[PDB]
Amino acid sequence: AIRKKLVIVGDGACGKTCLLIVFSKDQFPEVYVPTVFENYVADIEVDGKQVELALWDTAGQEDYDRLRPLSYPDTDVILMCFSIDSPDSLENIPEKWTPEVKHFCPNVPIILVGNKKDLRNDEHTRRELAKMKQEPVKPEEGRDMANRIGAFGYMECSAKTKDGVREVFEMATRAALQA
C-alpha cells in the first residue's frame, strides 16, 4: 500500500468541498452536508494496485496567498476544479490557478474537473446565466481548457447525483502512480 497525496484547488463555490465529502462519506449526506472537510485517507484499489490516498481541500484559503501554498508540499495529483454553472470560474483556471499550481507543484499531474454537471439542464441555472448573457460550460469548452493548460485529462462529475465521482478519484490515483 503506497501513500499518495491529492489536493483539490479552485474558486470559492466550485463544489470542491462537496466533492471530497461525497467521495469520503460511506453513504450520501441525506440529513446534513458539512460546511468543511478536515482530511481523509482513502483505500483505493485501481487496476490491481492498492493505494492509500490522502485527500485535502483548499476551501477557505482562496484569499490568503501566503497560507494557501502550505497545502502543496509533496502533492502527487492536483484536481483543478471549476463549476459548470459558472463560466467565470473557467476563465480563472488559466489566469490564476494554473500559474500557481505549476510554480509550487512542477511536474505534478493536474486533472481538470468540471463539477455540478447536473446544472447543465437545470432551468433556474439557465435563466440566471441568460441575464448575465451567458450559458453553462459546454463539454468542448472544458476539454479546450484542459488542452490549453496541459492537463493530464478532463473529467466531469456531479457531487449531488454522485455521477462521475468514483471515476475522478480512481483516475487521480492512476495519475499519482505514474512517474
Binding site: 446534513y32 460546511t35 502550505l70
Partner: protein, 235 residues
C-alpha cells in the same frame, strides 16, 4: 479525548444527536442553525484531539524513547503547547455553553441561543493577539518541520521504527506527523466558513446577528495578519 465528549459529538449532526421527540419541537431554521453550531464544536474537539496527538503521542514519545539531538523535537512540533493551551481553553468554553443549554433530565438535548459573545471574546483583544503571534510563528516554521521530519525518517532507523509503531492504530490513519501539521495550519481558515453559515441562520435575535457579524469580521482581520506575518524558514 474523553469518552463523554466523544459520545456527545459522535452523531453526524445536531438533528441526529438530540432525541427525535426533542428535534420535532423546533422550527426548521433553529435545527439548521444548531446543525452548524454543533459542527463548529465537533471540529474544535477534533482540532484539540489533533494537538494532543502531537504533544503526548509524537513530541513526548520522541523525548522518552529517542536520543534525538536537542532542538530537533522543537523544530518538528513548533508552538504545539501554546496551540494546545489556546484551543483547549476555547473548546472548554464552547462545551460549557452547550452544557448550560442542556434540558434538565437530559445529557443530549440542548439549543444554543448565544454563541457570538464567546466568538467575539476569542477573536478579540489579548486572546486574538496571542493566536495571531502563535499561528504566524507556526505557519512560518511549517515547511521546515515537514523537511526535518523527512530527513529524520530517511536517515534514522530508530525514528522510522518509532513512527511505524505509534501510527499503527487505525484511529491514527489520517493523523501522521505531516498530516497533523497541515491539519493545524488549515484550522484557522475554517472559522470564517463555519461562522458565516451560522450567521446565515441567526436572524431571529438581532443582538446575535450583530455579534456573529462582529466575530466574522474579527476572524477575517486575524487571518489577514497571520497571512501577512508568514515568512517561511528553511532547513
Amino acid at each position: 479525548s474523553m469518552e463523554m465528549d466523544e459520545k456527545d459529538f459522535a452523531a453526524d449532526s445536531w438533528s441526529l444527536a438530540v432525541d427525535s421527540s426533542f428535534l420535532q419541537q423546533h422550527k426548521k431554521e433553529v435545527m439548521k442553525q444548531q446543525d452548524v453550531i454543533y459542527e463548529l464544536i465537533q471540529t474544535e474537539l477534533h482540532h484539540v484531539r489533533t494537538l494532543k496527538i502531537m504533544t503526548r503521542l509524537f513530541r513526548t514519545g520522541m523525548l522518552e524513547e529517542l536520543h534525538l539531538e536537542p532542538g530537533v523535537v522543537q523544530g518538528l512540533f513548533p508552538c504545539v503547547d501554546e496551540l494546545s493551551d489556546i484551543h483547549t481553553r476555547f473548546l472548554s468554553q464552547l462545551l460549557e455553553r452547550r452544557r448550560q443549554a442542556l434540558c434538565p433530565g437530559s445529557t443530549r438535548n440542548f439549543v444554543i441561543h448565544r454563541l457570538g459573545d464567546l466568538l467575539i471574546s476569542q477573536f478579540s483583544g489579548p486572546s486574538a493577539e496571542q493566536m495571531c503571534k502563535t499561528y504566524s510563528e507556526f505557519c512560518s516554521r511549517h515547511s521546515k518541520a515537514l523537511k526535518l521530519y523527512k530527513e529524520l525518517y530517511a536517515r534514522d532507523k530508530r525514528f522510522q521504527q518509532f513512527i511505524r509503531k505509534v501510527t499503527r492504530p487505525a484511529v491514527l490513519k489520517r493523523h501522521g506527523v505531516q498530516e497533523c501539521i497541515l491539519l493545524v495550519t488549515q484550522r484557522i481558515t475554517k472559522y470564517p466558513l463555519l461562522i458565516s453559515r451560522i450567521l446565515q441562520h441567526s436572524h431571529g435575535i438581532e443582538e446575535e446577528r450583530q455579534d456573529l457579524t462582529t466575530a466574522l469580521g474579527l476572524v477575517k482581520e486575524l487571518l489577514s495578519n497571520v497571512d501577512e506575518g508568514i515568512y517561511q524558514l528553511e532547513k
